[PDB]
Structures are given as C-alpha cells and as structure tokens.
A paper describes a structure:
Here, we report cryogenic electron microscopy structures in which a p300/CREB-binding protein (CBP) multidomain monomer recognizes histone H4 N-terminal tail (NT) acetylation (ac) in a nucleosome and acetylates non-H4 histone NTs within the same nucleosome. p300/CBP not only recognized H4NTac via the bromodomain pocket responsible for reading, but also interacted with the DNA minor grooves via the outside of that pocket. Representative writers of lysine acetylation (Kac) are E1A-binding protein p300 (EP300; KAT3B)8 and its homolog, CBP (KAT3A), which can transfer an acetyl group onto the NT lysine residue(s) for all four histones.
By preparing CBPBRPHZT (residues 1084–1873) protein corresponding to the same construct as p300BRPHZT, we also determined three complex structures in which HAT of CBPBRPH is oriented toward H2BNT (CBPH2B·H4acNuc) or H3NT (CBPH3-I·H4acNuc and CBPH3-II·H4acNuc). The overall conformation of CBPBRPH·H4acNuc complexes was almost identical to that of p300BRPH·H4acNuc, and the H4acNuc-binding modes of bromodomain and HAT were also almost identical to those of the corresponding p300BRPH·H4acNuc structures. Whereas the inter-molecular arrangement of p300H3-II·H4acNuc structure was determined only at 6.9 Å, the CBPH3-II·H4acNuc structure was determined at 4.2 Å, so the domain arrangement of CBPBRPH and the structure of the H4acNuc-interactive region in its bromodomain could be determined. The density of H3NT toward HAT could be modeled for the C-terminal residues after K36 (second panel from the left). Collectively, these results suggest that not only p300 but also CBP can acetylate multiple non-H4 histone NTs by rotating themselves on the nucleosome with their bromodomain bound to the acetylated H4NT as the axis.
Numbering used by the authors:
A (entry chain A): 36 to 134
B (entry chain E): 45 to 135
C (entry chain H), D (entry chain D): 31 to 124
E (entry chain B): 11 to 16, 21 to 102
F (entry chain F): 19 to 102
G (entry chain G): 14 to 118
H (entry chain C): 14 to 119
I (entry chain K): 1088 to 1242, 1267 to 1372, 1385 to 1555, 1620 to 1638, 1652 to 1700
Write the structure that this text describes.
Amino acid sequence: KKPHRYRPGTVALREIRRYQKSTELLIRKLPFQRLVREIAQDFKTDLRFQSSAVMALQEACEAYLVGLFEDTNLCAIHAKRVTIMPKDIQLARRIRGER
Amino acid sequence: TVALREIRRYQKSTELLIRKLPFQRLVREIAQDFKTDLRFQSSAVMALQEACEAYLVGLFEDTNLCAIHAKRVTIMPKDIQLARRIRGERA
Amino acid sequence: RSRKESYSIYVYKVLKQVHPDTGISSKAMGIMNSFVNDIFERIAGEASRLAHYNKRSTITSREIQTAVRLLLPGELAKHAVSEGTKAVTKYTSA
Amino acid sequence: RSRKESYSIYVYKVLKQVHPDTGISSKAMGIMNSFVNDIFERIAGEASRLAHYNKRSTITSREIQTAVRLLLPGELAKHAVSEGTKAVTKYTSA
Amino acid sequence: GKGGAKVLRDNIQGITKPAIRRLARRGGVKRISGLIYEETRGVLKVFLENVIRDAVTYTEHAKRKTVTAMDVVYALKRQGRTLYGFGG
Amino acid sequence: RKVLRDNIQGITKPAIRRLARRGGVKRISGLIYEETRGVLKVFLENVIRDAVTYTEHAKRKTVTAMDVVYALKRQGRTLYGFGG
Amino acid sequence: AKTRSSRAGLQFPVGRVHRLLRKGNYSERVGAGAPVYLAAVLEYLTAEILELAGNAARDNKKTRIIPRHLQLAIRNDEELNKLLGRVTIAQGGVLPNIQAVLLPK
Amino acid sequence: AKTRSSRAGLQFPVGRVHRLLRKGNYSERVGAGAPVYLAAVLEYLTAEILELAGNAARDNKKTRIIPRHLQLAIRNDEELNKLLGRVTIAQGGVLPNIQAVLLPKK
Amino acid sequence: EELRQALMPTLEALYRQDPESLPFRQPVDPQLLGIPDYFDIVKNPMDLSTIKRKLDTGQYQEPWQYVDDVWLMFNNAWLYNRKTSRVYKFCSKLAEVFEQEIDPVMQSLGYCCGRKYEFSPQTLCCYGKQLCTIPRDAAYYSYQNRYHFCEKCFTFEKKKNDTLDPEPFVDCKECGRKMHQICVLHYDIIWPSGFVCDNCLKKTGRPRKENKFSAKRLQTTRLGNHLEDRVNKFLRRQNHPEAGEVFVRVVASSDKTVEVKMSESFPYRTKALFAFEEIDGVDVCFFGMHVQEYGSDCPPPNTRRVYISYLDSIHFFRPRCLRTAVYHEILIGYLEYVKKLGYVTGHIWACPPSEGDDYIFHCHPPDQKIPKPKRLQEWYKKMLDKAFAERIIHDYKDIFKQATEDRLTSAKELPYFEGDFWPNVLEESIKEKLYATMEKHKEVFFVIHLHPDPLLSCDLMDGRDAFLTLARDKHWEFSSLRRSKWSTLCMLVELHTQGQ
DNA sequence: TCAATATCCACCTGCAGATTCTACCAAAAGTGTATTTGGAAACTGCTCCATCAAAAGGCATGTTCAGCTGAATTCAGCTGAACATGCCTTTTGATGGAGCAGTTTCCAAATACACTTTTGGTAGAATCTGCAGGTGGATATTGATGG
DNA sequence: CCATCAATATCCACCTGCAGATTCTACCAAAAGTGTATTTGGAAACTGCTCCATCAAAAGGCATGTTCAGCTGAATTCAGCTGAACATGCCTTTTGATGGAGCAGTTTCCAAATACACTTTTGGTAGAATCTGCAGGTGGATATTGA
C-alpha cells in the first residue's frame, strides 16, 4: 500500500554523523587478521602476530581509509558530483604521491 | 595548437623560467619582512628560484590533473585549492 | 619485569596543574606519552642536525631553541622559547 | 682553505667503467654528489635508528642490509643486498 | 575430533562490502558506486603491502618469530603515518 | 638599505603562463595569476623564514645555499646541485 | 639537595631528559641547560594540549579526558593541527564536517 | 700494502665511508664490514643511475651526461622515481607528457 | 574400463578440493592421528584412495556400489567428526561437490542420478500408548521393523534411534539397471506393467503412459475452483516465464461438532484443501490449510464464523518471489468466498511451529525458515492490508482490541474452536486475569470482520494427524524438490485410489 | 497541520578501570675531585655582496574572435531506503605448547693510540672539445582557400 | 570530407669558437693501513615465563540477498563571454666593474662538560582495599521528515 520510506540521502547523512561522532573500529577483526596473516605468509612463514599489533594495523588502515575517502569525496565534489568513482581514488592517490 | 607548441617547447628545455631580478627583489622584500640587514648569496638566490620553479611545476601538473578530472581543460582556483589540500599543505 | 620507561607521573602532575579535577584514561595517557616521546625525538634530531651543520660536537640550549623555532608553529614556538628561557634563567640563578 | 671531500674521483671511475666514452659535467657531478650524500644520510639514519631499536650499540652489515631492504624497493634492494653480501664475503676472505 | 592443530587464500575478499561502506561513511561519502569495493580492497592491499613488509623486515632482523606492536608502529612512523597509543 | 615593497608583482603574467605551460596546462583563467603569486609567497614564507632562522643559529649575517638546502630538506623539498 | 627539575621549576624530569639525550646518540656532548630547555618545552606543550583537552571535555559534558577529546582539541587548533599533520590517533575519530553540496536544498 | 677498498673489490672508498659514519654520530660502534657494505650499495646505485643517464644521453645523440638526461632517465625508471619521489634535480626538467585530452579532439 | 572411465572425473573433482579432500586422501590411521576410538564407531573405515584402488582394479560391478561406498564414507566422516569440526565442513563440501558432479556423467551412463539418499531421522511412534514418541538417540524395542515400543512401555530386538532408512531402489524390466524410485517418479499402481527406462521407450516410440492420478483430475469444488481461478489470473497478469499452472482442490469436507470441555455442543463444517503447481512436468504440492466453518444455525457466539486451524506451505514454489503473493491470493480468495457465502467473522491463529513439529507436510526442508512470531504477525498484517485494498475485508483487528471494543465481560462470549488455545486457557483457569492473557497473546490471534459444496468423505485426510502418520510411515518427505514430487505423486495416488 | 520516527536527555544499576596506600628495591640524580676540551674573545687577510654604468631580450596593452564553459533540458538507470534471511564474530573459559626474554659464561670483534704509507683536492700551465647559435635548406603542419 | 598553395617552429646536415671539461707535474697535510694491548658487545646454552593459537558453544548484530523508485549521473544545445593569438610600443632585465661588510684563519685561556666513586632520592611496581565515571538499559519529552 503505502510503506514509510525516507528520501534517499537522509539515512546516509545520519550514518555519516553517527560514524563521525563515534570512534569504534568498523572493519571486522577476524577477516582483517586473516588478511594480515596471509600477507605476512606471502612475506615469510612462521611469523606470529600479537593482538596489539593486529589492533595497530586495524587502526592505521581505518585512519588511512578515512583520509583517502575524504580526499575522494573532495575530488568528486570538484567535478560537481556527490558520488565516488575510481577516478577520484586515482586522483587522490596520485596527488598524495603514493602512485 | 600554439599552446601545445610552447607546452612542448618548455617541457623539452630546462632553462630558468622566472626572471632573476624580480625573484631576487621579492626574496629580499620577504626576508626583510622576516629580518632586516640580511645579505644574500647568488647561489642561494638560484636555489630559491629552482626550488620555486619545481614546486610551481608540480602544483601546475597536479592542477591540470584536477581540472581534467572535472572534464575541463582550463584550470580553476578550486583545482589549486583542492590539490594543495590533498597534498596536506592546507588541511 | 624490565623497567619500562615512561613520563606518566610528570604528565599527571601537569594535568593536575592545568585541570586539578580532571583525570585521564590509560589509552589517552599512552597517547600523551607517545606524543611527548615523538616531540623529544624530533627536537633531539633537529638539534643534532644543527650541531652537525656548524661542525659543533656539543648541543646547548641555543640548538634546542632553534629546533623549537624551526619545528613548532609561530605562537607555540614563541611560547616554548619564552618558557625555555625562563627555565634556563631559573636554573642558572638556582 | 678547509678541504671539502667529495666522491668525484670514485663517481668518475664508476662512470668510466660503465660508459668509457661518456663524460660528465660539473652540474651533473654535483647532482651525483648530492644524491650519494643523501642516500648515505638516509641509510645511516635508518641503520642508527634500527640499532637503537634493538638496544644495540654496534652497527654491523646486518643492520645495513635490513635498512637497504627497507629503503630500496624490490629489484634495487635485492641487487644491493647481493652485492653487499658478496663484498663482505670478499673482505672477510682475505 | 581428529583435531588439535590447524590454505593461502580468503584474504582480499575478507574485507566485507559493509566495512568499506562504513569507512566511506566515516569519511563523509554520501553516495558510493557499486564498483568502488574492488579497487578499495586493492588500495588496502597496497597499504598492507607497504606496512607489513617493513614490519616483517624489522622482525626478521630482531631474530624474532613474532611480530610486535612496536615494530608495527615503527614501520608506520618510518612511512610518514605515525600512530599513537601502541608505544607501550 | 631601501625598504622593498610590492615586489610580488615581479612575477609577471607571461611567467606564470609559461610555468603553467611547462606543467601541461593548456588554458589559464584571468585570476589564476594572483592566486599563484599568493601561493609562491606562502612557499617563500615557509622556506626563507627557515633559512633566516638557520643563518641566525650560525651567528651569520649572510644567507648561504647550504642553509637553503637544509631548510628545503626539512620541509620535504630536497634539492640537488647546491650542496648537501 | 634539590633536583634539577625542582631547581628550574619544571615538573618534567631534567636529568631523565639528559639521560635520554645521552643514550640517543644525538651528539658527543650535551650541554647543561639543554635538558632543562627541552623539558620546559615538553611541559609547555603537554600543559597546552591538556588544557585544550579539558576544555573539549567540558564542552562534551565529560570529566575524563579521552582520545576523542584529544583529537578534537588537536584539530580545533590550527597550529596544533599543523604540528601533528602526519600523526595518526587511536580511537580519536574525525571532526564533524558535512560538505556544502551534500547538504539538502 | 692493500687498501680495504681494493680488498673488497669495490671502487667506492671504504675508509672514507667509515670515517663519515664515525663523524655522523649515528652509533657508538661501527662494524668492520659496515663501510664495505655501504660502499657496495652506494657503488651499485651510482652505477645504475650513471648507466641510465648514459642511455638517456645516447637516445638524444649526446656524449656528455647532463642533468636533463639524468632526470629523464630516473623518472623513466619507476623504482628510481619512487626512490627519488621527493627529490628535485636542478636543470633537469620534466618528462614530455601530454594528456590525450590536451591533444586536438577533431 | 567403461565404469572406471565414467567414474574417474567425479573422483578427481573430489580430490582437487583443497584442503577439503586432504584428510580423505589416505586411510584413517588411529595410531598416527591419536584416535583409538575410531574403530569403535566406524565399523567400515575406508577412504578415497581405497575408491581409486577399487576403480583401477575393477572391483565394482556397477556404479551404484561406488556411489554407496562414497556416501558411506561421507556418513562415517559426518558421524565420527563433530558438527563444529573442520573435518565435518570438509566432508560436507566434498558431498556437495560429488552431488553436483556425479549427476551429468551418471545420467549419460543411462541412469537417473548418482546419489545414495537416506531418509531423515524420523521419530518412531508407539502402538500401545498411542501417544508416545521415541526421540532420537534413545533406545527402543522393534519387532520386524514394523512395531515399536519405548523404554517406559516395556514395563523385540533392542535398537537405537540413530539409524537411517535408505531410499528404495527399482530395477528396469528390460535393461536391468538399478535407479532411485523417487528420481524417476515411478509408482506400481500408476504403471502396473512395470518400470521401463526412458531410453527403452525411445527404442519403442510410445512414450510413458499418461498418469490419471493427477491433481487436475481431482474432484472440483466451487471454493477450490475460485481459488485456482484467482491464482491462475494472478500468474497470467504477472506472466512469469518460470511460473506454471496451479491447481487448487478440496480433498476433504465433512460435518463435525465441538464439545465444551451455553450450548453443550457446537456443530461446524470442516474442509481441507491443497495447492498443486506444475513443476518440471509433474505436480508438486506447496500449500495446505484447514478451516472450521460455523453457519447461521450454530448457537452463539460461534454463529457464522470461519476459523483457520492449521496452515502449512512449501518453499519450493516457482518463482520464489511470487510465493508470498500466491499464498496471499489463496487466503484472500478464501476470505472472499466465505464472505460471499454469508459468513461474518474470521479467526486466524498466527502461531509459529515449534522445532521438529510439522503441521501438515512432514519433514520440512532443513533450509526452510521457521518464522518468528513477529514476522508471522507482519506477514498476516500485510496480507490483510492487501485484502483491504481490494475492498474485500471490512476490517481486521487483534483479539484483545476486538474484545475491549465489544465490551465482553463473560467467557461464554469467547469463540470456541476445536483444538484452540483459548478453550485450553479457560480450562486451566477454571482448574486453577483473562484480560491479561488476552493482552499477552494480543498479536498472536487475528479477528477479521467481512461485512454449497457437497461433502467429500476422506478418512485419510480427516485431520492432520492421520496424514502425518501416513507420511511418516511411508517416508513421504519434503526436504528436497524430488522428494516433494514423490510425496505429491504418492498422496495423489492415495487420494485417487483410497477415496470413500 | 499532522502522523511516523530518530534524538536528546534524565535516571538508575552493575563493574572493569582509575585512583589511594603498604612496603620494596634497583635505577638513576646529585655531590665532590681531576682532566680535558668547545669555544668566547681579540686581531686580522680574504671573499664576495651591494651599488652603479650601459646594452638588450624580452614584457605590458589593446584588438579580434574561435572556442572553453556553465546554465538549461531531458532521461536511463544506479544505488539508497526498506525488508526478509540467516551468518558467523564475539565473548567467555580453558589448554598444549611454540616462542620471548632473563641469567650465566666467555670470545671474536671493535677501540685507542703510534707509526709508516698513500693520496686527493689544490694551484697553476697548457691542451682538447660539446655544444650554443647562426646561416642556408626544408619539412611536417596547420589555419585557410577552395573542390 | 579532404588534397593541398603557403607562412612558420624546428630536426637535423653542419661548424666553428669558447667556456667548460679534460691531461699533465708537484706538494703536502689529511686520511688510510698496519701493529699491539685493551675492552666489550654480543653469540651460545639453559631455562622461567607470558601471552600467542587453538578449540567449544550460543546468538544476536549486522552481512547477505531482493525490490521499488528518487533523483543522480550522464548526454545534448546553446549563448554570454572569458581568454588565446598577435601586432605595437618601450623598458625593464641582464652583464660587467668596483668599494668595503662580514666570512673565515690564528692564538689565549677560562667557564664548561666528561669519568667516575659513593650516597641519597626516587620511579616502577608486587599486592590488597576503597573510590569512582561512565557502560548499558528504561522511559518519555523533543526535534526531524515526509506527505
């Protein structure tokens, strides 16, 4: 019949505000730990990891991703857009000098 | 057509592009603002000029990349501002 | 049980000096300790470079003052320079 | 006049070994010297920091090899490590 | 049973799509394209490539078989991404 | 020592246009030049101030290229050919 | 009789700063007033950041300083942000900032 | 009567590098093979950059290496560009690179 | 050589799994793995290497032996290893790989499929007490695999409820090949001339004889005709290519009376109907539900009231997107029919089933979700809103709101239905706050305000208990599409040949 | 104006973490001699930096117009909001043991001179040459005339 | 759409003169290597010990999958207009020569920092007991949104 539905974007802004007002980790611990262990094995086998080390990797990766997403949003805004596309990611990384 | 011509010409050559005397005068004025009675070496002035040219070239290429990122070939102030912000020079 | 080096008590005393009724969590306390250690490393490295530039084998208060001026922002650099000068004067007069 | 040491002769010998029929200009030699000094400073700083990290007061070839792997990317690091190991083995074989 | 003790896969796809969505939302992203996720995971793998390599090299020099938080933060600070809180 | 002023205008419009061309920029708007001059002034404030402080640390009254090179290096703008 | 920190009127440990400078291989010799100056600078920076964090916590209706308050204080100060522009925080978050184009109407 | 540089089969000066390491106050003690390893790494990097500069000069029909050829050579090499990503060479210029959009769109 | 070359690809596919196949590549060694109790549980240990050796040696006379050996290895691995163990997951993955790999090659050989199917662990019943069931992993006493007694009823071979009944097999009269009866969908009554393979009929020209025991040939009723017409119209307006024809038939209708545990007895009419859909050329039953109807002659407060006693469905309807819509269409059509007949009030008991309990269709699929009470209430509310949109339902409320609106003060005004929860609550209260109970179960019960079929004698479907008992006895499961098809064929045959 | 809905906020309760003592104990800090050396200060030769002369390779304005660009318009479809389904990560608790680091012993390697050996800018002399322009073609090349 | 008279920047075929790079003799303080006694940072050998991995189980917070459409991303026109290209004027920029403000070279020696032997203080920190700010759940007044 007539289901209640918010206009698109409002819940997105609510989520943005909620995640900016909070500092908890967003990436699940176990898959990130598995990825870190797999990459370490790609480097060298029999290399153990401490829990504090895994937490440090998670925090650093989340902070770097947040900064990259902010730069990507700025790049998308530059072209009169509000959606992120790979060109924004590439431009942000190139300006940052990583590429 | 012509614009690409001097683009290629200046990309091929490496000579200094900012005139020596105006740059030296600007450096002297800004240093006097920092501190008066300050002697300058010619090598120091050359170093400032070359560093400034390199920084401006990098800023201009990043600005062109930003401008074409917005489907444009003419650079806008927003291009320079956002390039500097992503570089961390502003925020 | 090795002696783990930290600035815990001094930073807590500073907090009492500025905010007597405000505490600090262990995580934030480690944040503060790491920040102070990083600033110490930066100042020491810049002073070492300054000493090497002038062929000087000794680092004095002037080297650290110059390092602070180079690294710290304008108002912060001036305030730190004033605090260091006051500390040196008090130590000399002590 | 105070002597100002430089890698001019060694860089020139390396160039002659690689390109016997190619010369080098004064500005190019200055760029060579600046680059080699910067690389030496970076690698020495990395080695010193790493020796401080493990509470080691002596820097050996292992620390420099680790710092080379940290700094040089991929093929450069592998070739530098191989040549350094070969040079160390040759030095210790006499 | 037949256990007591424990493949090199399931690493890049471990990062879930909602995780990338949350990371973008924390960065102020309002609209996310459906194909952002794969290159986001690739950039994340590049970052781990940069960090864990240095951490592993530091651990290898230290004659240790366990990666510690000090090595991680120290590789982070040598790369220009100094992190605080794990210096204990 | 004459007090120099209004020397930012010494960075001529053709100079900024040529610098943009060297960077691959094809078209330049009219107000880019003033912003470029301001950015150059900001960069000069970042570098020359550090050089002046380095010179003062050495008890010298003349700025040398070595101080400039060190100031550029500490700001992540390492330059070659001028020593260091 | 009196410690160097107490003699100079600083809470930070002067002798400890001197020991760390000596063990850090920064220079062959270290001046007498260098640890005093460095301790004074460190104490000033710590006091300023702690005062800003306390102000942020008071604005946040909290009596305990948390990394969120620390990061809010750091980013709310332009000079502190410039000093710590390449510093990553744990459990600190980001400033509330919504882009103008993202805003409705 | 054999020098340490010649003993290790390296052109770079082992003794000068060891003295510079001592003078830089990097560590209290320096190993014997440490200057040898330093000389080997520095010589390898110098040979690599010099061969790149020579190739760049040959490509431009020139017999003397100039900073322009060196800058082009190192920017061409992605590993060398990454190594010197924050390094500027005086009188080196930039790589000739024009975007396809900047080209005529007839 | 033919058997070896036919069975090698599936075995190789089993091997190539990594690391799922690693524990199964070698015989289990209790000494090496430190599991001395392995022989105590698994009486026939064997592994993939044994299978390869037998295939190379040609120890298999026909591939069903290989299939049985593979499934026996899977069963042993599942039994010995705990469900949370990684070995159990590896065995499950290997079983899925074998299932998806054996079918094409095994069909190309000339058979139905290459699976060894075992029935679900059905709970046995009791003959004496008539109300006692034997739970799983409980000792019982069985006579001729036909009579069963529990431990309490003892005060007969001793057995345990941890066994499984294998699926029946059939042998072709001409070819002689053995194949699953369920997969080929062959019944003796339908085809008394025996079972003939599809290839053999292809060598004959004449196809399989038409099955007269279909859902379409069932006796039609005006209510069932209206429901089937509405469903067909909805499917046509949707025009889904995967959707097939749906037949709705009432297979049981009689008159009974409910006795109070006020009129002494209330008469009513009970009717049972099912929904069948054309899938893969055969009928599949996917919906069934029971109603109790009290006409104008019924004493109050039950006068002119319809009540939905039990409701069951199968999630195998195609497409899955239109399954909910089809269920809504059927129920809305029933409500419209009872409104047209003159009924005033309808009652719905939205109570989710308990785990292991079947309303109508026995052996619900393991992947079929048992909805939570809130989800069932939301589903019923959505259905009632959809019906209201079609100006069919006058109003819908909950039992508590309806009671407080009607200002009811006595329990005699409450509706009385057979097996309903409220009469049990009233009996418990009398033996041992009624509004509190009404409010506690407010969302469970739905009351709907809305404002000639001949009786079919069917002892089999006269109530869900006999149907469930027959389904349990004959292993009529609904856990898979093929099992559902076999169960639908069997129930259609039973209704056609055992009707009264 | 109003109904559905997320938010702010006050309030109450259990508990891991922050705060307060008791006693310890090794790691520095400070103090009191002996020694040495970094450099402040005075004097002074040597650069090279600011200032000023002319000669020239460019920069500063105005005009014309093809083309870059932003507003306006329309529309295919992309992902946001909502909902059913159910997945698997977290926490709690325990355990066999791979592995980190403390303690002891002791040795090849680094170090502080002393002496002898080589040696690389350094300054001046004289020879060699790579290429920066410039002159005479001359060659794609592109705006423009025209088929 | 394009084959092509005609003005124009420049690759190359070239070459010559000069600032710059290359070649040779000599000198010597600055390193560089060798010799020897001394010290030590670190290798091995064993072990006490802490958290790293692994296993088990429930279940609920979201990960996963599906659907509708709001409006966002994308494509198309076009007209105001900002800038590109260019001829005109001239002047500011570049190069060379010349007084002295400070950059460095030399010598004294005195306040200043090592080296080290105690003695006292003082910061982790084993361990138990009481205090305390916000984690988390409840409830309802309060914005916030959409039709």
